[PDB]
Amino acid sequence: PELTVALILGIFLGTFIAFWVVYLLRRLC
Amino acid sequence: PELTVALILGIFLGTFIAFWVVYLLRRLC
Numbered sequence: 001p002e003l004t005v006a007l008i009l010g011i012f013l014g015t016f017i018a019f020w021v022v023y024l025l026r027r028l029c
Numbered sequence: 030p031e032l033t034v035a036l037i038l039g040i041f042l043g044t045f046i047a048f049w050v051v052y053l054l055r056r057l058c
């Protein structure tokens with residue numbers, strides 16, 4: 001199903017972006 | 030369009046799961 005793979009890809013991206021943002025906070029700020 | 034919403038929904042859901050993983054790994058480890 002296309003709606004499920006779209007959600008799973010978002011969940012993976014959302015989890016990565018959250019850790020990526022904190023990484024930017026520790027290194028840039 | 031429904032795929033974009035499902036993607037964005039997963040992204041914001043992923044940001045919650047990231048802090049949920051840190052919570053469980055603090056308890057587990």
Ligand SMILES: CCCCCCCC/C=C/CCCCCCCC(=O)OC[C@@H](O)CO
Nearest residue numbers: 003004007042045046048049050051052053
């Ligand atoms: C087409 C239907 C698709 C259904 C998909 C359902 C996915 C359900 C998602 C489950 C993940 C729930 C994550 C829930 C995360 C809640 C926030 C949390 O745990 O914060 C931790 C802090 O309080 C620690 O101090």
